Amino acid sequence: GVDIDGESDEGVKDIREENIYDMLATKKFAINVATEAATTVLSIDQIIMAKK
């Protein structure tokens, strides 16, 4: 994993020690939302506005 400790320690811990994992519903659903979020930004080459 990635070391979350605030004290200096050699190496990193293991996932089995603290049982810190990500759910499938959290990871899989976040990918489809992140791709569609960046797609809309790249799809806009210009904006069109009017006077209120």
Add this chain to the structure above:
Amino acid sequence: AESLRRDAALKVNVTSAEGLQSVLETNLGPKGTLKMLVDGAGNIKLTKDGKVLLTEMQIQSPTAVLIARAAAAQDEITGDGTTTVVCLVGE
């Protein structure tokens, strides 16, 4: 005498057609691009169809007004190729 010389009001119409086509040149076919439409009340409308685009924008240039009004009649009959017709007029 004070006669003839210049018709240059045509230059405004030619420039008005290049600026209008350059906006719709970005979105064509399956490779087209998305645009934003703001009505002033805070509603963000994202649509690639030129029919909704031309209605939400108000252009003071009379050249683009005639193109937008003529495109409304084609969208009620043909219903396709709104951007294509505009690109053929400017080019």
Add this chain to the structure above:
Amino acid sequence: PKAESLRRDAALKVNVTSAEGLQSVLETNLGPKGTLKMLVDGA
């Protein structure tokens, strides 16, 4: 992230525009039906 975008083409358009104004002046004397240019050095 520094920049790399365009060769920008602008220095080329200035060179073309400079040649357009040079020919437009000099094309008036071409042929027997052309016009006669005059030069004045101030003296």
Add this chain to the structure above:
Amino acid sequence: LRELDIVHPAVKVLVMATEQQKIDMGDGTNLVMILAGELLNVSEKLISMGLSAVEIIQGYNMARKFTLKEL
């Protein structure tokens, strides 16, 4: 993002994308905002080189199906 009204669309889409993650799940609100923000930062190298944003989207669509299969 709820108390701050957004005008520019690029940030507003990320706000509407946050509601997509927040309503359907109680976790991962920061996962979408950080991941979607980095995809545009790494895309500046392709935009600079001259690669159009149209084929950039096609690259993410092919990589999305390859990523979901490995999950």
